[PDB]
From Swiss-Prot:
UniProt protein name: Type 1 fimbrin D-mannose specific adhesin
Gene from which the chain derives: fimH
Keyword vocabulary terms for this entry: Fimbrium, Signal
Spans through the membrane: none
S-S pairs: none
Membership in a protein family: Belongs to the fimbrial protein family.
One Gene Ontology cellular component annotation held by this UniProt entry: pilus tip
A GO BP entry: cell-substrate adhesion
Main location: other
Source organism of this protein record: Escherichia coli (strain K12)
Gene Ontology molecular functions: D-mannose binding
Function field: Involved in regulation of length and mediation of adhesion of type 1 fimbriae (but not necessary for the production of fimbriae). Adhesin responsible for the binding to D-mannose. It is laterally positioned at intervals in the structure of the type 1 fimbriae. In order to integrate FimH in the fimbriae FimF and FimG are needed.
Positions spanned in the full protein: 22 to 179 of 300
Subcellular location: Fimbrium
Amino acid sequence: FACKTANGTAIPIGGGSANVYVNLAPVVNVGQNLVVDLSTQIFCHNDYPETITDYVTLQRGSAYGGVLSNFSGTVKYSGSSYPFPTTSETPRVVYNSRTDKPWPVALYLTPVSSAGGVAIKAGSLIAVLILRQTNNYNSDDFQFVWNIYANNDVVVPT
Ligand SMILES: CCCCO[C@H]1O[C@H](CO)[C@@H](O)[C@H](O)[C@@H]1O
């Protein structure tokens, strides 16, 4: 079991940590959602799917910078929505193919009020999302840590 991002960065068998830089809506009014769709950025596969089933969870989803201070909302994982920042481990998704498949995680965030200008700075840490992978085979329990950075400024206007 291993992962990679849309920019080609791999996290190998056994886990590790990678930086993901996300493009964001440049202007988000009060009353609008900012969506951070990591399902278009992070992909994984099962290396031996004929004999092993891999189980994958969002173990923890943490908010930083302007996302922690200027926004509020939820995380959708697979077919269900949860508080973000997270207060629990999600249920398991099955990976059962060697073709990379999306990690089905998206943040749906809304402005808590206008910041007066820049609500998320370009290059700032906005989230840390921990993917936990186990299986039905041995006692592997690996963490793939995704540090999410804003690629551009997000303004919540007055
Ligand atoms: C004998 C299995 C060696 C490869 O083990 C790896 O591949 C399998 C299948 O993806 C995973 O379940 C496991 O955690 C490792 O990432």
